Ligand binder design. Sequence first.
Ligand code: ANP
Ligand code: CL
Ligand code: CL
Ligand code: MG
Ligand code: MG
Length: 370
Amino acid sequence: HYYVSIDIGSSSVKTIVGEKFHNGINVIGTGQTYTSGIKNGLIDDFDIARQAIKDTIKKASIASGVDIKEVFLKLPIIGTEVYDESNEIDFYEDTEINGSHIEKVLEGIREQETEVINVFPIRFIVDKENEVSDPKELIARHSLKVEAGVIAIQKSILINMIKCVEACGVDVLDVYSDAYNYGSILTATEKELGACVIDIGEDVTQVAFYERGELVDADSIEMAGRDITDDIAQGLNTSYETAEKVKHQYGHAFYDSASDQDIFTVEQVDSDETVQYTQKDLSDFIEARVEEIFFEVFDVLQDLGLTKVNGGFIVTGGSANLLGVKELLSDMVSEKVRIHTPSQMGIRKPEFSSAISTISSSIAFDELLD
Ligand SMILES: Nc1ncnc2c1ncn2[C@@H]1O[C@H](COP(=O)(O)OP(=O)(O)NP(=O)(O)O)[C@@H](O)[C@H]1O
Ligand SMILES: [Cl-]
Ligand SMILES: [Cl-]
Ligand SMILES: [Mg+2]
Ligand SMILES: [Mg+2]
Protein backbone atom coordinates (compact mmCIF):
# COMPACT_ATOMS: atom_id res chain seq x y z
CA HIS A 1 0.00 0.00 0.00
CA TYR A 2 1.18 3.58 0.58
CA TYR A 3 3.71 5.00 3.04
CA VAL A 4 2.98 8.32 4.72
CA SER A 5 5.70 10.09 6.68
CA ILE A 6 5.40 13.21 8.81
CA ASP A 7 8.34 15.50 9.67
CA ILE A 8 7.26 17.83 12.48
CA GLY A 9 9.71 20.65 11.76
CA SER A 10 10.37 23.89 13.63
CA SER A 11 9.71 25.83 10.40
CA SER A 12 7.24 23.53 8.69
CA VAL A 13 5.44 20.25 9.15
CA LYS A 14 6.22 18.07 6.14
CA THR A 15 4.33 15.05 4.82
CA ILE A 16 5.13 12.73 1.94
CA VAL A 17 2.95 9.97 0.51
CA GLY A 18 5.09 7.39 -1.19
CA GLU A 19 4.84 4.04 -2.85
CA LYS A 20 7.58 1.43 -2.59
CA PHE A 21 9.32 0.35 -5.79
CA HIS A 22 11.99 -2.31 -6.11
CA ASN A 23 14.75 0.28 -6.48
CA GLY A 24 13.18 3.33 -4.88
CA ILE A 25 10.22 5.35 -3.72
CA ASN A 26 7.60 6.77 -6.04
CA VAL A 27 6.28 9.94 -4.45
CA ILE A 28 2.59 10.54 -5.14
CA GLY A 29 1.84 13.53 -2.94
CA THR A 30 3.05 16.07 -0.38
CA GLY A 31 1.78 18.43 2.29
CA GLN A 32 3.64 21.29 3.92
CA THR A 33 2.50 23.78 6.52
CA TYR A 34 4.60 26.51 8.10
CA THR A 35 3.82 27.03 11.75
CA SER A 36 4.99 28.65 14.95
CA GLY A 37 3.59 25.71 16.91
CA ILE A 38 6.99 24.01 16.88
CA LYS A 39 10.18 25.49 18.33
CA ASN A 40 13.59 23.87 18.70
CA GLY A 41 12.24 20.63 17.23
CA LEU A 42 9.59 20.31 19.97
CA ILE A 43 5.97 21.32 20.46
CA ASP A 44 5.74 24.95 21.61
CA ASP A 45 1.92 25.17 21.56
CA PHE A 46 -0.02 21.88 21.38
CA ASP A 47 -3.16 23.35 19.83
CA ILE A 48 -1.27 25.23 17.12
CA ALA A 49 0.96 22.20 16.46
CA ARG A 50 -2.11 19.92 16.16
CA GLN A 51 -3.68 22.34 13.67
CA ALA A 52 -0.60 22.44 11.47
CA ILE A 53 -0.14 18.68 11.49
CA LYS A 54 -3.82 18.14 10.75
CA ASP A 55 -3.70 20.73 7.99
CA THR A 56 -0.61 19.08 6.44
CA ILE A 57 -2.21 15.61 6.43
CA LYS A 58 -5.19 17.29 4.72
CA LYS A 59 -2.90 18.81 2.10
CA ALA A 60 -1.16 15.47 1.66
CA SER A 61 -4.50 13.69 1.28
CA ILE A 62 -5.92 16.13 -1.28
CA ALA A 63 -2.68 16.06 -3.30
CA SER A 64 -2.36 12.28 -3.36
CA GLY A 65 -6.02 11.34 -3.37
CA VAL A 66 -5.37 8.95 -0.51
CA ASP A 67 -7.41 8.81 2.68
CA ILE A 68 -4.47 9.05 5.09
CA LYS A 69 -5.24 7.14 8.28
CA GLU A 70 -1.88 5.64 9.36
CA VAL A 71 1.55 7.30 9.36
CA PHE A 72 5.24 6.88 10.17
CA LEU A 73 6.63 9.69 12.38
CA LYS A 74 10.24 10.91 12.29
CA LEU A 75 11.73 11.92 15.64
CA PRO A 76 14.41 14.60 16.02
CA ILE A 77 17.83 13.86 17.48
CA ILE A 78 17.01 15.40 20.86
CA GLY A 79 17.14 13.57 24.21
CA THR A 80 18.47 10.67 22.17
CA GLU A 81 20.93 7.88 23.01
CA VAL A 82 22.58 5.39 20.71
CA TYR A 83 24.06 2.20 22.10
CA ASP A 84 24.69 -1.48 21.50
CA GLU A 85 22.75 -4.44 22.71
CA SER A 86 22.14 -8.03 21.81
CA ASN A 87 19.43 -10.60 22.35
CA GLU A 88 18.86 -14.27 21.69
CA ILE A 89 15.79 -16.43 21.18
CA ASP A 90 15.53 -20.21 21.47
CA PHE A 91 13.96 -22.76 19.16
CA TYR A 92 12.68 -26.15 20.23
CA GLU A 93 12.68 -27.62 16.73
CA ASP A 94 14.51 -27.07 13.44
CA THR A 95 13.40 -23.63 12.33
CA GLU A 96 13.89 -21.95 8.99
CA ILE A 97 14.61 -18.31 9.92
CA ASN A 98 12.16 -15.82 8.42
CA GLY A 99 11.07 -12.23 9.11
CA SER A 100 8.95 -13.13 12.17
CA HIS A 101 11.96 -14.58 13.99
CA ILE A 102 13.94 -11.44 13.29
CA GLU A 103 11.12 -9.28 14.54
CA LYS A 104 11.01 -11.35 17.72
CA VAL A 105 14.71 -11.24 18.56
CA LEU A 106 14.86 -7.45 17.96
CA GLU A 107 11.62 -7.01 19.91
CA GLY A 108 13.23 -8.33 23.08
CA ILE A 109 15.79 -5.51 23.01
CA ARG A 110 12.88 -3.08 22.76
CA GLU A 111 12.04 -4.60 26.14
CA GLN A 112 13.25 4.06 32.49
CA GLU A 113 13.38 7.76 31.52
CA THR A 114 13.69 6.79 27.88
CA GLU A 115 12.12 4.44 25.41
CA VAL A 116 13.77 2.36 22.72
CA ILE A 117 12.37 3.55 19.40
CA ASN A 118 14.66 1.82 16.93
CA VAL A 119 16.54 -1.49 17.00
CA PHE A 120 18.45 -2.37 13.83
CA PRO A 121 20.62 -5.46 13.23
CA ILE A 122 24.39 -5.19 12.93
CA ARG A 123 24.79 -8.95 12.51
CA PHE A 124 22.94 -12.19 13.30
CA ILE A 125 24.24 -15.44 14.78
CA VAL A 126 22.58 -18.81 14.19
CA ASP A 127 23.11 -21.60 16.71
CA LYS A 128 25.88 -19.88 18.67
CA GLU A 129 28.43 -20.07 15.85
CA ASN A 130 27.44 -19.10 12.32
CA GLU A 131 27.67 -15.30 12.11
CA VAL A 132 25.77 -13.72 9.19
CA SER A 133 24.15 -10.44 8.12
CA ASP A 134 21.06 -11.96 6.50
CA PRO A 135 19.79 -15.06 8.34
CA LYS A 136 16.61 -15.50 6.32
CA GLU A 137 15.53 -18.93 5.08
CA LEU A 138 18.46 -20.69 6.76
CA ILE A 139 17.95 -23.42 9.39
CA ALA A 140 18.54 -22.99 13.11
CA ARG A 141 18.37 -25.98 15.44
CA HIS A 142 18.78 -24.08 18.70
CA SER A 143 18.94 -20.31 18.39
CA LEU A 144 19.05 -16.91 16.71
CA LYS A 145 21.10 -14.14 18.30
CA VAL A 146 21.34 -10.54 17.15
CA GLU A 147 23.93 -7.86 17.77
CA ALA A 148 21.91 -4.71 17.31
CA GLY A 149 22.28 -0.97 17.24
CA VAL A 150 19.79 0.78 19.47
CA ILE A 151 18.19 4.23 19.54
CA ALA A 152 16.22 5.38 22.56
CA ILE A 153 14.59 8.74 23.27
CA GLN A 154 13.26 10.61 26.30
CA LYS A 155 9.73 9.44 27.05
CA SER A 156 8.45 13.01 27.28
CA ILE A 157 9.37 13.72 23.68
CA LEU A 158 7.91 10.48 22.31
CA ILE A 159 4.66 10.68 24.28
CA ASN A 160 3.95 14.28 23.27
CA MET A 161 4.84 13.94 19.59
CA ILE A 162 2.61 10.88 19.17
CA LYS A 163 -0.35 12.29 21.11
CA CYS A 164 -0.24 15.49 19.08
CA VAL A 165 -0.22 13.55 15.79
CA GLU A 166 -2.86 11.02 16.81
CA ALA A 167 -5.09 13.94 17.83
CA CYS A 168 -5.47 14.61 14.11
CA GLY A 169 -7.33 11.34 13.74
CA VAL A 170 -4.41 9.27 12.42
CA ASP A 171 -2.50 6.28 13.77
CA VAL A 172 1.26 6.34 14.20
CA LEU A 173 2.31 2.93 12.93
CA ASP A 174 5.96 3.48 13.77
CA VAL A 175 8.56 6.03 14.80
CA TYR A 176 11.96 6.64 13.20
CA SER A 177 14.74 8.68 14.73
CA ASP A 178 16.47 10.90 12.22
CA ALA A 179 19.65 9.18 13.49
CA TYR A 180 18.54 6.06 11.59
CA ASN A 181 16.80 7.89 8.71
CA TYR A 182 19.95 9.63 7.44
CA GLY A 183 21.51 6.27 6.85
CA SER A 184 19.32 6.25 3.72
CA ILE A 185 20.56 9.44 2.06
CA LEU A 186 24.14 8.14 2.10
CA THR A 187 25.68 5.97 -0.60
CA ALA A 188 27.05 2.51 0.33
CA THR A 189 30.61 3.82 0.11
CA GLU A 190 29.88 6.81 2.37
CA LYS A 191 28.28 4.60 5.05
CA GLU A 192 31.30 2.33 4.84
CA LEU A 193 34.21 4.82 4.84
CA GLY A 194 32.76 6.87 7.70
CA ALA A 195 30.41 9.69 6.71
CA CYS A 196 28.85 12.60 8.57
CA VAL A 197 25.39 13.96 7.72
CA ILE A 198 24.70 17.56 8.70
CA ASP A 199 21.08 18.73 8.49
CA ILE A 200 20.83 22.47 9.08
CA GLY A 201 17.15 23.37 9.55
CA GLU A 202 15.68 26.37 11.36
CA ASP A 203 16.10 25.95 15.10
CA VAL A 204 17.96 22.65 14.98
CA THR A 205 21.05 21.39 13.23
CA GLN A 206 21.45 17.62 13.43
CA VAL A 207 24.56 15.50 13.11
CA ALA A 208 24.76 11.75 12.48
CA PHE A 209 27.85 9.70 11.70
CA TYR A 210 27.76 6.36 9.88
CA GLU A 211 30.62 3.91 9.53
CA ARG A 212 31.02 0.33 8.27
CA GLY A 213 27.47 0.59 6.96
CA GLU A 214 26.10 1.35 10.41
CA LEU A 215 25.11 4.35 12.51
CA VAL A 216 27.79 5.10 15.09
CA ASP A 217 26.40 8.16 16.86
CA ALA A 218 24.50 11.42 16.47
CA ASP A 219 23.44 14.62 18.20
CA SER A 220 21.85 18.02 17.59
CA ILE A 221 22.87 21.66 17.97
CA GLU A 222 20.52 24.56 18.75
CA MET A 223 21.91 26.80 16.05
CA ALA A 224 20.63 26.94 12.49
CA GLY A 225 18.60 28.91 9.94
CA ARG A 226 16.78 31.10 12.45
CA ASP A 227 20.11 32.27 13.83
CA ILE A 228 21.28 33.21 10.34
CA THR A 229 18.12 35.32 10.00
CA ASP A 230 18.64 36.88 13.46
CA ASP A 231 22.15 38.04 12.55
CA ILE A 232 20.87 39.44 9.25
CA ALA A 233 18.05 41.30 10.99
CA GLN A 234 20.49 42.80 13.51
CA GLY A 235 23.10 43.63 10.86
CA LEU A 236 20.88 45.23 8.23
CA ASN A 237 18.85 46.86 11.01
CA THR A 238 15.67 45.41 9.54
CA SER A 239 12.79 43.19 10.72
CA TYR A 240 13.00 39.41 11.07
CA GLU A 241 10.54 38.87 8.23
CA THR A 242 12.35 41.04 5.71
CA ALA A 243 15.67 39.46 6.73
CA GLU A 244 14.11 36.06 6.13
CA LYS A 245 13.19 37.12 2.58
CA VAL A 246 16.55 38.58 1.58
CA LYS A 247 18.14 35.44 2.99
CA HIS A 248 16.18 33.35 0.51
CA GLN A 249 16.42 35.79 -2.42
CA TYR A 250 19.99 37.05 -2.16
CA GLY A 251 21.59 34.77 0.39
CA HIS A 252 25.08 33.40 -0.10
CA ALA A 253 27.34 31.68 2.47
CA PHE A 254 30.68 32.31 0.80
CA TYR A 255 31.73 35.96 0.99
CA ASP A 256 34.50 35.69 -1.65
CA SER A 257 32.09 34.18 -4.17
CA ALA A 258 29.36 36.59 -3.06
CA SER A 259 28.43 39.28 -5.59
CA ASP A 260 28.62 43.07 -5.35
CA GLN A 261 26.48 43.91 -8.37
CA ASP A 262 23.62 42.14 -6.64
CA ILE A 263 21.77 44.87 -4.80
CA PHE A 264 18.51 45.12 -2.89
CA THR A 265 16.70 47.64 -0.74
CA VAL A 266 15.67 47.02 2.83
CA GLU A 267 13.48 49.13 5.09
CA GLN A 268 14.76 50.14 8.52
CA VAL A 269 13.14 49.06 11.77
CA ASP A 270 13.76 52.31 13.66
CA SER A 271 13.06 54.84 10.89
CA ASP A 272 11.13 55.35 7.64
CA GLU A 273 14.59 55.52 6.16
CA THR A 274 15.61 52.79 3.71
CA VAL A 275 19.06 51.34 3.01
CA GLN A 276 20.73 49.66 0.04
CA TYR A 277 22.87 46.52 0.38
CA THR A 278 24.96 44.22 -1.79
CA GLN A 279 24.91 40.42 -1.69
CA LYS A 280 28.49 40.54 -0.38
CA ASP A 281 27.28 42.61 2.58
CA LEU A 282 24.61 40.00 3.28
CA SER A 283 27.15 37.21 2.92
CA ASP A 284 29.35 38.61 5.68
CA PHE A 285 26.57 37.71 8.12
CA ILE A 286 25.59 34.40 6.56
CA GLU A 287 29.11 33.01 6.25
CA ALA A 288 29.93 33.93 9.83
CA ARG A 289 26.90 32.06 11.20
CA VAL A 290 27.22 29.04 8.92
CA GLU A 291 30.90 28.79 9.82
CA GLU A 292 30.00 28.85 13.51
CA ILE A 293 27.46 26.06 12.99
CA PHE A 294 30.11 23.94 11.28
CA PHE A 295 32.58 24.59 14.08
CA GLU A 296 29.80 23.51 16.44
CA VAL A 297 29.54 20.35 14.33
CA PHE A 298 33.27 19.64 14.65
CA ASP A 299 32.94 19.96 18.43
CA VAL A 300 30.08 17.44 18.44
CA LEU A 301 32.23 15.02 16.46
CA GLN A 302 35.10 15.36 18.96
CA ASP A 303 32.92 14.97 22.04
CA LEU A 304 31.37 11.96 20.30
CA GLY A 305 34.96 10.88 19.80
CA LEU A 306 34.80 10.77 16.03
CA THR A 307 37.90 12.25 14.47
CA LYS A 308 38.44 10.96 10.92
CA VAL A 309 35.54 11.40 8.48
CA ASN A 310 36.84 9.24 5.61
CA GLY A 311 33.51 9.04 3.76
CA GLY A 312 32.97 12.79 3.53
CA PHE A 313 30.34 15.31 4.61
CA ILE A 314 26.74 15.38 3.39
CA VAL A 315 24.93 18.66 4.09
CA THR A 316 21.16 18.88 3.84
CA GLY A 317 18.08 20.56 5.31
CA GLY A 318 16.41 23.90 4.55
CA SER A 319 19.48 26.10 5.02
CA ALA A 320 21.32 23.86 2.55
CA ASN A 321 19.45 25.81 -0.17
CA LEU A 322 21.82 28.65 0.73
CA LEU A 323 24.38 29.24 -2.02
CA GLY A 324 28.03 28.91 -1.04
CA VAL A 325 27.53 26.32 1.69
CA LYS A 326 29.48 23.65 -0.21
CA GLU A 327 32.34 26.13 -0.80
CA LEU A 328 32.39 27.27 2.81
CA LEU A 329 32.56 23.75 4.22
CA SER A 330 35.11 22.41 1.76
CA ASP A 331 37.06 25.59 2.39
CA MET A 332 37.40 24.51 5.99
CA VAL A 333 37.69 20.73 5.64
CA SER A 334 39.94 18.35 3.67
CA GLU A 335 37.38 15.58 3.10
CA LYS A 336 34.68 15.52 0.39
CA VAL A 337 31.55 17.66 0.62
CA ARG A 338 28.12 17.54 -1.03
CA ILE A 339 24.63 18.93 -0.49
CA HIS A 340 21.99 16.23 -0.56
CA THR A 341 18.66 16.92 -2.26
CA PRO A 342 15.95 14.27 -2.73
CA SER A 343 15.67 13.38 -6.43
CA GLN A 344 11.89 12.91 -6.73
CA MET A 345 9.63 15.50 -8.35
CA GLY A 346 7.95 17.76 -5.84
CA ILE A 347 10.41 17.18 -2.99
CA ARG A 348 13.61 18.34 -4.67
CA LYS A 349 14.54 20.57 -1.74
CA PRO A 350 16.98 19.65 1.06
CA GLU A 351 14.26 20.41 3.61
CA PHE A 352 12.50 17.19 2.51
CA SER A 353 15.37 14.79 3.33
CA SER A 354 14.01 13.78 6.75
CA ALA A 355 10.46 13.04 5.51
CA ILE A 356 11.59 11.05 2.48
CA SER A 357 14.23 9.08 4.35
CA THR A 358 11.62 8.28 7.02
CA ILE A 359 9.82 6.37 4.29
CA SER A 360 13.05 4.66 3.23
CA SER A 361 13.34 3.52 6.87
CA SER A 362 9.75 2.23 7.09
CA ILE A 363 10.33 0.28 3.90
CA ALA A 364 13.64 -1.14 5.17
CA PHE A 365 11.96 -2.57 8.26
CA ASP A 366 9.06 -3.67 6.11
CA GLU A 367 11.41 -5.81 4.04
CA LEU A 368 13.48 -6.90 7.04
CA LEU A 369 10.51 -8.16 9.07
CA ASP A 370 8.34 -9.51 6.29
N1 ANP B 1 16.19 29.25 -0.29
C1 ANP B 1 16.65 29.32 1.01
N2 ANP B 1 17.79 29.98 1.31
C2 ANP B 1 18.25 30.05 2.57
N3 ANP B 1 17.59 29.48 3.59
C3 ANP B 1 16.44 28.80 3.38
C4 ANP B 1 15.92 28.69 2.07
N4 ANP B 1 14.78 27.97 2.14
C5 ANP B 1 14.56 27.63 3.38
N5 ANP B 1 15.56 28.13 4.18
C6 ANP B 1 15.67 27.97 5.63
O1 ANP B 1 15.54 26.59 6.02
C7 ANP B 1 15.02 26.55 7.37
C8 ANP B 1 13.90 25.50 7.46
O2 ANP B 1 14.31 24.35 6.71
P1 ANP B 1 13.81 22.99 7.45
O3 ANP B 1 14.82 21.83 7.06
O4 ANP B 1 12.45 22.66 6.98
O5 ANP B 1 13.84 23.21 9.06
P2 ANP B 1 12.67 22.36 9.84
O6 ANP B 1 12.80 20.90 9.59
O7 ANP B 1 11.22 22.83 9.34
N6 ANP B 1 12.78 22.77 11.46
P3 ANP B 1 14.03 21.98 12.29
O8 ANP B 1 14.66 20.75 11.47
O9 ANP B 1 13.42 21.49 13.54
O10 ANP B 1 15.21 23.01 12.65
C9 ANP B 1 14.50 27.98 7.70
O11 ANP B 1 15.41 28.63 8.60
C10 ANP B 1 14.51 28.68 6.33
O12 ANP B 1 14.78 30.09 6.46
CL1 CL C 1 22.42 -12.27 23.74
CL1 CL D 1 15.89 8.63 1.11
MG1 MG E 1 14.27 19.45 10.36
MG1 MG F 1 8.81 27.60 14.43
